[PDB]
Amino acid sequence: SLKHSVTQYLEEIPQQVQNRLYTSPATCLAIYRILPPLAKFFIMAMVFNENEVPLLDLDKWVNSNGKLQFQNAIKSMKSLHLLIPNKSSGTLMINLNPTFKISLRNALTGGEVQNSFGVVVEENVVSLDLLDEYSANKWETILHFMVGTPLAKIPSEKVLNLLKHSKLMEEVNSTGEFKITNEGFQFLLQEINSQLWTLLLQYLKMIETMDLVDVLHFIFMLGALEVGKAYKILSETQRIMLQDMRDYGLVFQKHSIFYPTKLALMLTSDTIPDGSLIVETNFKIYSYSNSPLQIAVLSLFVHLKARFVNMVLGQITRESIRRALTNGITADQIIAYLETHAHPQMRRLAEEKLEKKLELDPNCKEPLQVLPPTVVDQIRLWQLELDRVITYEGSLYSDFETSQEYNLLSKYAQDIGVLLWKDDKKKKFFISKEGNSQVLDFAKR
Amino acid sequence: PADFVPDSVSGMFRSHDFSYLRLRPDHASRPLWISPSDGRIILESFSPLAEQAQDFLVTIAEPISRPSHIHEYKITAYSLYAAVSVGLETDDIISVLDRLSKVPVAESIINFIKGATISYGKVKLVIKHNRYFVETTQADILQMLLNDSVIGVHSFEIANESVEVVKKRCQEIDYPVLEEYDFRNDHRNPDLDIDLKPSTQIRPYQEKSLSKMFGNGRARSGIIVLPCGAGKTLVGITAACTIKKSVIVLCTSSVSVMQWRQQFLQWCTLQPENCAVFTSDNKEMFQTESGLVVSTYSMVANTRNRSHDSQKVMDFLTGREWGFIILDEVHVVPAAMFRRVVSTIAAHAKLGLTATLVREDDKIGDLNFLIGPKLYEANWMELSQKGHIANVQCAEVWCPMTAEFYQEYLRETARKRMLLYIMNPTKFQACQFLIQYHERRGDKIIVFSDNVYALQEYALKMGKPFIYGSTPQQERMNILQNFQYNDQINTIFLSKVGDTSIDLPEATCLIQISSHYGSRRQEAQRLGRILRAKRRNDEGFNAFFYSLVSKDTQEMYYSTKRQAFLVDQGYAFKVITHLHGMENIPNLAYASPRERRELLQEVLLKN
Amino acid sequence: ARARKGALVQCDPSIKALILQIDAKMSDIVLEELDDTHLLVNPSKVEFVKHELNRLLSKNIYNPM
Amino acid sequence: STIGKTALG
DNA sequence: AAAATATCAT
DNA sequence: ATGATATTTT
Ligand SMILES: Nc1ncnc2c1ncn2[C@@H]1O[C@H](COP(=O)(O)OP(=O)(O)O)[C@@H](O)[C@H]1O
Ligand code: BEF
Ligand SMILES: [Mg+2]
Secondary structure (H helix, E strand, O other): OHHHHHHHHHHHOOHHHHHHHOOOHHHHHHHHHHOOHHHHHHHHHHHOOOOOEEHHHHHHHOOOOOHHHHHHHHHHHHHOOOEEEEEEOOEEEEEEOHHHHHHHHHHHOOOOOOOOOOOEOOOOOOHHHHHHHHHHHHHHHHHHHHHOOOOOOOOOHHHHHHHHHOOOOOEEOOOOEEOOOHHHHHHHHOOHHHHHHHHHHHHHHHOOOOOHHHHHHHHHHHHHOOOOOOEEOOOHHHHHHHHHHHHHOOEEEOOOEEEEOHHHHHHHOOOOOOOOEEEOOOOEEEEOOOOHHHHHHHHOOOEEEEEEOOOEEEEOOHHHHHHHHHHOOOHHHHHHHHHHOEOHHHHHHHHHHHHHHHHHOOOOOOOOOOOOHHHHHHHHHHHHHHOOOEEEEEEEEOOOOOHHHHHHHHHHHHHOOOEEEEEOOOOEEEEEOOOHHHHHHHHHO | OOOOOOOHHHHHOOOOEEOOOOOOOOOOOOOEEEOOOOOEEEEEOOOOOHHHHHHHHHHHOEEEEOOOOEEEEEOOHHHHHHHHHOOOOHHHHHHHHHHHEOOOOOHHHHHHHHHOOOOOOOOEOEEOOOOEEOOEOOOHHHHHHHHOOOOOOEOOEEOOOOHHHHHHHHHHOOOOOEOEEOOOOOOOOOOOOOOOOOOOOOOHHHHHHHHHHOOOOOEEOEEEEOOOOOOHHHHHHHHHHHHOOOEEEEEOOHHHHHHHHHHHHHOOOOOHHHEEEEOOOOOOOOOOOOOEEEEEHHHHHOOOOOOHHHHHHHHHHHHOOEEEEEEEOHHHOOOOOOOHHHHHOOEEEEEEEEOOOOOOOOOHHHHHHHOOOEEEEOOHHHHHHHOOOOOEEEEEEEEOOOHHHHHHHHHOOHHHHHHHHHOOHHHHHHHHHHHHHHHHOOOOEEEEOOOHHHHHHHHHHHOOOOOOOOOOHHHHHHHHHHHHHOOOOOEEEOOHHHHOOOOOOOOOEEEEOOOOOOOHHHHHHHHHOOOOOHHHOOOOOOEEEEEEEEOOOHHHHHHHHHOHHHHHHOOOOEEEOOOOOOOOOOOOOOOOHHHHHHHHHHHHOOO | OOEEEEEEEEOOHHHHHHHHHHHHHOOOOEEEEEEOOEEEEOHHHHHHHHHHHHHHHHHHOOOOO | OOOOOOOOO
16 A cells, blocks of 8 residues: 555645655655556656657557556656656657656766765664664554553653544543544554554644655655664754654664664565464454564453463453444454454365365355354444444424425435435424534525 | 563453463473463364363363364363273373473462362272162271261161262262272172174264273263264163163153163164063063163152052162163253152162253252263264264344334233244244245254244144144154154144154254243253254255344343353354345235234233 | 424334333433334433433343353 | 345344 | 142243 | 243042
8 A cells, every 4th residue: 555655645745846855866766666667667768868758659668458557657657747748849758857867867876966865884783682672662662552551651742642633543532531443443454564654644744844845855765774874963854853753763863873773674665473363153262472562452352361471362242342343443344353363273274164165066156254254243243233223413394384395495405415304294304413504594595 | 470570461361361481392282271370271173182182181171162273171170070080190180281281280270180189089889789888998087987977998888868968978078979880790680681783883982982981890970971963872772781780761751761762672682571661651660680671750750649550660660779770861860859869769880861961050060979970071063073963054043023013022021021022923934934945955844932822823823733741642752753754744843842852863954933041951952953864974964953033132132141052062153134035935924014913912812 | 494403313113112112211302203213302312312222222132241 | 144134024 | 631749940 | 939831640
């Protein structure tokens, strides 16, 4: 999703801002890697040629089969203003952005880069001992607060405010606490790379007047830096934002010099299993997860009963699923988490059942199911219980002198999509509270 | 718990955290987890050393839940007593448990097994001509026992009536009573010459179950628990044959008494000269020097009023000393009056055979001192894979209650409440559709219904037979035999009479429109009625078990509580909210609103 | 022309009967019976009946421990 | 698994 | 066909 | 402690 979500954010950026962004070669290289593979082919060809190339020739470059990919590639390039079209003498010529072209060329070859990539100090630090531990602790702490489980350490105020403003992990002052919404659980399910960009993108939106271009340049530059190998401390806005990243764990400072963190390398791009669990027809759960986070996240919708060093065992109960649904989690997410973390034994047994079913009747094909059907059905049914009775807020209109007026009002309410119930025999109809003002205004006129 | 840092999320576990103990280096091999505080055991059946571990754990633990992959066992004092009884000691148990444990056994667990593993064989009870002598080879220990006022080489005769009192008392005191009988040594009691027929062959699990009883070469009392249809009748027959003494069989029902007679005849060498049935139908008694006597609990247990003709046979039963006694369906022995059967009849070895060792009250544990320890048990899922008991796809159909019907449900009282949802018109349609659909597939369907009135009403509307208390023995047998061997009569209704202890391989499907209050025994027994289908080895075959309930009624509460035992054994219930193809059915009962109103008035007039 | 503030409740026949019974116990719960599948209830009592419904159905659910 | 289908009746 | 005692669940 | 259902006897 990063290959698309990050692209969408860049497209929304104004053209003038995008042109400024292309100044730094490091950002250009990152923006080069996010484009579709076919876009990479065309862009690289145009980097080393300082001349206009007609669009027809680029079309000829592609085969008949891959016409659809070409259409997507050109649209993506045009969206980001990478390709500037020019119409003259009845010819449609396309050229690369001079700022992007020069910066990208400088990155590939040896040339002035205005120290965009930073400067090496030749002071390496063991990663498996300190940087990795520091990165895990910071990510472990922030995630623990998100899940809601108690933890003595508290995330910094700046990150706490961002989460409060952020849609995920909604906080209610009246309740006096912070709770996980549907988006919050989705964030937990998403991998580390998706989670990191999820927070980073929100921070970029929140920041107003720290220049946006400066922040984006540092973030893209951060990916270029490799684990360890501190670099000398760069705009003033970058320095303060660097401190913010340090609170997030993306960067480690000894107090002078900042060591890039492993998460920074993961930020560049992608790259029995831990966290897997077994679900029985008896509704028991046994998770082979020793990580403290895995136990906490499971406890959100599972009634934990005991734990060993090797694994944690619990059971799904009406209380556990009811609690999760009340928080805001959907039953679809609950099954998704259980299935993705299925134990290999469950997968092997499910495959055997599928093979036997196919042998009995290969004509009919059904999807492979890892979890037992009964457990999934019970969880879905429990969700249906919450929506057993539906309540709407609105007003009821009746006692109409003429049937024509009632019909016109009912038709108008339905058109604007605010009619909840109607009955011609009684000449009554109930509308939603949101549309009450609109209906009243229409009645007056 | 020393030099261990509490976890941040340790608060989620209410003092049940077991992280202080460190995982063993070879944890990838050991298949067992031992919980110190609770004493529970978690076993992985997909790991090496699974098969012998399951056999060992069952011996030293009473299974709680046995799903496909993770098996949950528990250790109790009674379980330990049974384990030490069958040729075992603390040293062997401790070594094996530690070897199979992924983590070291805690000191608390070690103490629990140690305490109850030493009292095995101090006090013994034997039966002479008609006098019970609670004797022991040593003389010092018994003197301490005698000093107690509760009881009232040394051998002393104890009152026959008060035998149960001392048996429980011995359990209360540190030394529990042992029940062993060396049938080989004693020949004073006449010996019955019987052996299994050459054609007969004992199945693997049946052989293993009987081996535990005769592990030391001497018969010992106990309870053997096998799934319905496993063949407990053959296990009992083999047990009687090996002892080679007089055998008396007590059975729950006369119909099952006939089954025991036929089954005994079909699977052994005994001749009619040595077989007599003391049932209501006929009081014939055997005059041979020794033989088999099969009776029922009610006849033997009855105390106040018994006919003189029955009295003479009962006196005959109490007269001679018997060598073996089989308490078929031992799940009812702990009843208030049926307990007297053990005391009245003097037998050296007593064996109990039942499929569902479940009882609502706390009287189930009493069996351990009335007959003997739970010798053996078998997995329902394991036998299903082997092809011994037919696979069943249980279901729980949800039948919504219509608005007119539902309104009368709320106002009515509790006792009247039952008849509103049992006679739910939606439930009636569901029962009709399932019967019609499964009759098309040529499947015999048994529809249980505890409520007699509802049972008759459904049967009359559907033009199908029924069996219950009012039905005479001759008619009940005729329906059973007919339904087994006639194509036209594919489905028959039943009642509480047929819930337990009846054999009928033809039945494959099963429905229950109504059922008794929440009780796991009846659910398991009814399910077992179709677990011995002869067409169980055919490829891709699955029996069916349908439970019709009314939504939002108290039946939903009972049904969930009524299937707990099946869930523990492994069976899984699937909820069927919608029955596809029901709308297209040309005729559905109580389709018109007028019919529903007429039925509502008719059922309301009942109370 | 007359607007009456209230809350619209759409539910299955069984829930409708329970709501009516609650209204019988307390006449101020429900305002009108719009249809066999629709009722009008006072907004102040919406939460009370909503919580009450989940309590009455609790009798039909077997809670293990 | 039949959940969302119309209830029988 | 009517009596009387057990059993199983509230 | 009571109500169903079942069983045994006269
Ligand atoms: N060894 C065997 N070979 C074949 N059929 C057997 C064997 N053992 C038992 N059965 C069959 O199992 C069925 C049920 O036996 P039964 O003793 O009535 O079961 P339950 O355990 O329910 O009392 C009978 O049809 C019987 O013939
Ligand atoms: F367990 Be069986 F059906 F007697
Ligand atoms: Mg049997």
